[PDB]
Amino acid sequence: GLMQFTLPVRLCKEIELFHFDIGPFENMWPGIFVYMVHRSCGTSCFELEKLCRFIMSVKKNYRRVPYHNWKHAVTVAHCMYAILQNNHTLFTDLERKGLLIACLCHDLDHRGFSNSYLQKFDHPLAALYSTSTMEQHHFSQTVSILQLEGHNIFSTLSSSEYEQVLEIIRKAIIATDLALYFGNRKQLEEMYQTGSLNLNNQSHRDRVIGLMMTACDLCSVTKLWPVTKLTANDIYAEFWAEGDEMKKLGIQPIPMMDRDKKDEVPQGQLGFYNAVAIPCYTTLTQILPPTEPLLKACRDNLSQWEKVIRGEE
Numbered sequence: 284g285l286m287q288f289t290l291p292v293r294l295c296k297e298i299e300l301f302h303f304d305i306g307p308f309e310n311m312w313p314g315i316f317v318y319m320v321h322r323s324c325g326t327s328c329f330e331l332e333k334l335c336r337f338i339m340s341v342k343k344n345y346r347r348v349p350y351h352n353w354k355h356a357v358t359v360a361h362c363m364y365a366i367l368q369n370n371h372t373l374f375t376d377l378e379r380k381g382l383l384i385a386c387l388c389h390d391l392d393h394r395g396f397s398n399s400y401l402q403k404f405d406h407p408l409a410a411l412y413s414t415s416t417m418e419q420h421h422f423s424q425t426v427s428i429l430q431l432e433g434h435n436i437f438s439t440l441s442s443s444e445y446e447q448v449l450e451i452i453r454k455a456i457i458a459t460d461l462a463l464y465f466g467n468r469k470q471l472e473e474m475y476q477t478g479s480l481n482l483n484n485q486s487h488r489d490r491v492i493g494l495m496m497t498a499c500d501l502c503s504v505t506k507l508w509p510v511t512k513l514t515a516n517d518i519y520a521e522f523w524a525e526g527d528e529m530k531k532l533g534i535q536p537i538p539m540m541d542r543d544k545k546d547e548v549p550q551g552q553l554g555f556y557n558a559v560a561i562p563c564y565t566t567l568t569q570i571l572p573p574t575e576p577l578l579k580a581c582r583d584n585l586s587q588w589e590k591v592i593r594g595e596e
């Protein structure tokens with residue numbers, strides 16, 4: 284109960300900032316997550332023995348892929364911790380609990396491949412989940428882990444609170460399907476402008492949570508330029524492996540996934556920032572003003588990519 288997790292002075296302070304990088308020491312990442320849980324939710328919200336066993340089973344069920352890995356899971360949980368800590372009074376007890384877990388588990392058992400590739404390959408998961416394929420798998424994997432002996436971190440919840448937390452996590456994980464992000468942001472933009480946005484409307488809370496999940500999931504674009512630039516290598520590592528696999532199926536991949544079209548990455552990145560990232564952090568800053576540092580850092584990285592095109596780097 285009185286076993287408070289503590290970090291070195293530099294991490295203790297920088298972990299509070301949106302642009303924190305969790306570092307290259309894998310064995311510190313569990314402690315970084317518990318630290319964030321204990322500060323974002325409390326020391327009582329979970330049994331430490333169960334949470335630890337849950338974290339290590341989650342870790343075991345992330346694959347050794349270039350980007351969609353254990354580091355990504357913990358990085359996305361940290362962005363969410365930063366949002367929650369800067370918006371203290373806007374979120375319920377169950378929401379603080381559910382959202383950090385949701386972020387940690389949101390890419391469980393990812394193979395490094397898109398829903399599009401699973402469909403064209405005719406992977407069994409495409410037959411099981413026709414839409415948001417990997418995201419329905421990520422949630423399935425989360426439930427299975429919770430049901431392992433001594434892994435149910437939610438044990439102390441009532442049938443009503445347990446169903447509520449599992450429902451927050453499901454919606455949160457499904458929202459990380461980028462195909463669903465575009466419509467969700469449009470609706471939130473419209474609602475925000477017409478003044479219909481009501482955080483007592485559960486249907487509206489869901490949409491704002493979904494947008495927070497997009498924001499956290501894409502947060503590599505909100506890091507300091509060297510982190511953003513070096514993460515891009517890992518992101519494109521997976522994209523080019525998928526393009527290779529598309530060519531194995533006799534299908535020319537889109538330029539984004541074609542390793543022959545490496546020259547086109549910087550422009551491809553401008554399109555992503557302008558069409559996905561900046562709109563995401565723009566709408567999020569409108570609903571949740573304290574998240575403005577994510578938008579600012581994103582625009583900074585947009586500028587750096589434009590500098591890359593103009594031969595300035």
Ligand SMILES: N#Cc1cccc(-n2nccc2-c2nn(-c3cccc4c3OC(F)(F)O4)ccc2=O)c1
Pocket residue numbers: 459460461500501502503504518539552555558559
């Ligand atoms: N979910 C997810 C996800 C997956 C990989 C990667 C990222 N991610 N995170 C930070 C930056 C990026 C990124 N994503 N895309 C991308 C992904 C998916 C679909 C797409 C994408 O562009 C698209 F608009 F053309 O359609 C392209 C370039 C990027 O730098 C999220």
Ligand SMILES: [Cl-]
Pocket residue numbers: 322
């Ligand atoms: Cl606090």
Ligand SMILES: [Mg+2]
Pocket residue numbers: 389390417459460
């Ligand atoms: Mg995902």
Ligand SMILES: [Zn+2]
Pocket residue numbers: 355359389390459500
């Ligand atoms: Zn992800």
